[PDB]
């Protein structure tokens, strides 16, 4: 096994995904039209409702609605070619290096089969964790499989969604330390903030993790 495994969410934890979405939305409107791009987002927001970012299903439903508009499907070319390495948070690579010396670092992410893997790979994060990457539709429903890939006496989960940390905490209990970094917009959403138990630790920045070796309780 392992004394400790450090599990990381990717979006708004390791890398600034809000900024990616802001850049996408601005691009889409410029290339495809205000009306057309507004509509795709209305679909992408029901889907973000039901699942995490479902770029893909939103695309598939947009096509049914407007099968003549092939062009808007090229929005993928923005994501595919986006500079994700520029969006990695200051200190994020240092935290992964620092904690990697004490136990395996693993990226545990919700996502589709095209964009999310490509993001993690092209951001350079994939290789920073030596390919220790699991990507699910709902990671908190696959916690059994996470354990057998990366068995450990204790786990840490760093994630900006309190809902996820709360679900994982309920599943694993004292075997888990939950860390909520106050990054992105789920950090300041009042529903999230008010409807789930608090994380064990809150850090202002992902780079604050280098200051807490004592909390891992390692020999």
142 touches, from a second copy, Cl ion, none (C-beta below 5 to 8 Å by class): a second copy
**Residues in 20-39 at the binding interface with Cl ion, rule: CB under 5 A:** 27
x-or-dash string of contact with a second copy, 142-161, rule CB under 8 A: x--x---x------------
- The smaller minimum CB distance to Cl ion, of residues 24 and 135, is found at 24
Query: Interface with a second copy includes 36 (CB under 8 A)?
Result: no
HEC-encoded secondary structure of the chain:
CCCEEEEECCECCCECHHHHHHHHHHHHHHHHCHHHHHHHHHHHHHHHHHCCCCHHHHHHHHHHHCCCCCHHHHHHHHHHHCCHHHHECCCHHHHHHHHHCCCCEEEEEECCCCHHHHHHHHCCHHHHCCCCEEEECCHHHCHHHHHHHCCCCEEEEECCCHHHHHHHHHHHHHHEEEEEECCCCCCCCHHHHHHCCCCCEEECCHHHHHHCCHHHCCC
Query: Interface with Cl ion includes 130 (CB under 5 A)?
Result: no
User: Smallest gap, in angstroms, from Cβ of residue 152 to Cl ion?
Assistant: 8
Out of 34, 45, 60, 86, which residue is the one contacting a second copy (CB under 8 A)?
Answer: 60
Query: Interface with Cl ion includes 213 (CB under 5 A)?
Result: no
- The smaller minimum CB distance to a second copy, of residues 148 and 204, is found at 148
Out of 22, 34, 74, 85, which residue is the one contacting a second copy (CB under 8 A)?
Answer: 74
User: Smallest gap, in angstroms, from Cβ of residue 101 to a second copy?
Assistant: 24
- The smaller minimum CB distance to a second copy, of residues 75 and 206, is found at 75
Report the 10 Å Cβ neighbour count for 66: 15
Query: Interface with Cl ion includes 3 (CB under 5 A)?
Result: yes
- The smaller minimum CB distance to Cl ion, of residues 152 and 162, is found at 152
Residues that bind Cl ion (CB under 5 A): 2-3, 27, 103
């Amino acid at each position: 096994p392992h004394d400790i495994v450090f599990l990381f969410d990717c979006d708004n934890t390791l890398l600034d995904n809000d900024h990616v979405l802001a850049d996408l939305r601005a691009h889409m409107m410029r290339e495809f039209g205000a009306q057309n791009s507004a509509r795709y987002w209305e679909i992408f927001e029901t889907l973000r409702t039901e699942l995490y970012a479902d770029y893909l299903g939103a695309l598939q439903r947009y096509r049914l609605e407007q099968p003549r508009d092939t062009r808007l499907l090229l929005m993928s070319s923005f994501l595919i070619d986006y500079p994700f390495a520029s969006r990695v948070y200051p200190g994020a690579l240092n935290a992964l290096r620092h904690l990697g010396a004490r136990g395996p670092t693993v990226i545990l992410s919700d996502g589709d089969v095209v964009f999310q893997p490509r993001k993690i790979a092209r951001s350079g994060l994939w290789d920073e964790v030596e390919g220790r990457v699991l990507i699910y539709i709902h990671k908190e429903l696959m916690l059994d499989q996470v354990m057998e890939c990366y068995p450990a006496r204790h786990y840490v989960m760093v994630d900006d969604k309190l809902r996820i940390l709360a679900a994982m905490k309920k599943a694993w209990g004292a075997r888990l330390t939950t860390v909520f970094p106050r990054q992105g917009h789920y950090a300041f959403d009042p529903k999230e903030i008010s409807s789930h138990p608090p994380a064990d630790v809150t850090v202002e920045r992902i780079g604050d993790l280098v200051e807490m070796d004592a909390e891992w309780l390692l020999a």
